[PDB]
Structures are given as structure tokens and as C-alpha cells.
Design a protein around this ligand. Structure first.
Ligand SMILES: O=C(Nc1scc([C@@H]2CCc3ccccc3C2)c1C(=O)O)c1ccccc1
Ligand SMILES: O=C(Nc1scc([C@H]2CCc3ccccc3C2)c1C(=O)O)c1ccccc1
Ligand code: FES
Ligand code: FES
Lengths: 66, 66
């Protein structure tokens, strides 16, 4: 608990928060929780490379319809 | 040691959560910092993380439209 989690994303914003209306989502949204996506706040699979390199076990959050 | 998640479910090699819109309330707030004691939900722990590390991470909000 010394290192930043986010290294590069919107560093002029002092607290990055995203808010979406569930009515605006498609059938599925896949959100990044690793701060390595080139499509942040969406997951683009960059968590696998992170986990591979660091031995971590992070992954995305999926919001979907039943 | 450049891991993002330090302590959460470390017997799981890739932590992914998936929720159905239909089961959510008016507002669900999800943790993107891996420091919440209520993970995958946000409990405010990101502020302490940001202050300690100089980071700027925060949660993902899924809500019903106005
Ligand atoms: O890691 C990625 N996606 C992941 S990881 C886990 C899911 C879960 C798996 C099971 C599952 C079961 C029921 C309903 C949804 C899901 C989704 C998904 C997904 O639906 O995309 C990824 C990789 C490269 C580019 C973009 C995204
Ligand atoms: O609604 C919640 N949090 C919200 S709503 C808006 C913010 C941000 C937005 C950006 C921002 C930018 C600079 C300074 C403050 C803020 C506030 C936050 C936050 O957590 O920091 C919530 C948290 C835990 C449980 C339940 C609800
Ligand atoms: S790219 Fe960050 S969780 Fe998938
Ligand atoms: S406790 Fe992790 S984003 Fe709020």
C-alpha cells in the first residue's frame, strides 16, 4: 500500500469516478477495475497482462441483463 | 510486488463479478481500488489510498435514470 494503482489515466482529475444509467447500457457492459485499459472505464483485457506480469488476480466488473 | 490487489480473495486467480441490472437498487457503487472491506462494493477506502499514494482512483456507479 505504497504504490499508485492508476499510473496514467486522467491524472488532472483528482478522483476518477464514472456513473452510468442502467437504462443506457446495452445487454452488457464490462468495466475495468485494473486501470490498465486503453478504453477506460471499459475493460479491454489489459488485466491479463497485468496479472501475468505482477502475479495479481484482478479482473473486470460485468453489468448485464438477466 | 507491483500488484493492485493486496488482500482480496487471493485463492481466486482472477476476480470477476457479474450482476444483473434487474437485481440492482436505485444506485450501486462498485469498488475500483481493491481496498474496500465490502468488495465488490465501495466503502470509501479509496480516499485513504489516494491520500497515502498520491493516486486518484474512485468508484463506478450504476444507477437508475432520473
Ligand atoms: O476479459 C474480458 N471479458 C470478460 S472476463 C469475464 C467475462 C465474464 C465471463 C463469464 C460470464 C458469464 C455470464 C455473463 C457474462 C460473463 C462475462 C467477460 C466478458 O463478458 O467480456 C475481455 C477480454 C478482452 C477484451 C474485452 C474483454
Ligand atoms: O456515491 C458515492 N460516492 C460518490 S458519488 C460522487 C463521488 C465523487 C465524484 C467525483 C469527485 C471529484 C472530486 C472530489 C469528490 C468527488 C466525489 C463519490 C465518491 O465516493 O467519491 C458512494 C460511495 C460509497 C457508498 C455509497 C455511495
Ligand atoms: S482491462 Fe482492466 S479489468 Fe480488464
Ligand atoms: S472503496 Fe474502492 S473505489 Fe471506493
Amino acid at each position: 500500500n505504497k504504490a499508485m494503482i492508476n499510473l496514467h489515466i486522467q491524472k488532472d482529475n483528482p478522483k476518477i469516478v464514472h456513473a452510468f444509467d442502467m437504462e443506457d447500457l446495452g445487454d452488457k457492459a464490462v468495466y475495468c477495475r485494473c486501470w490498465r485499459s486503453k478504453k477506460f472505464p471499459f475493460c479491454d483485457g489489459a488485466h491479463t497482462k497485468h496479472n501475468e506480469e505482477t502475479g495479481d488476480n484482478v479482473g473486470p466488473l460485468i453489468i448485464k441483463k438477466k
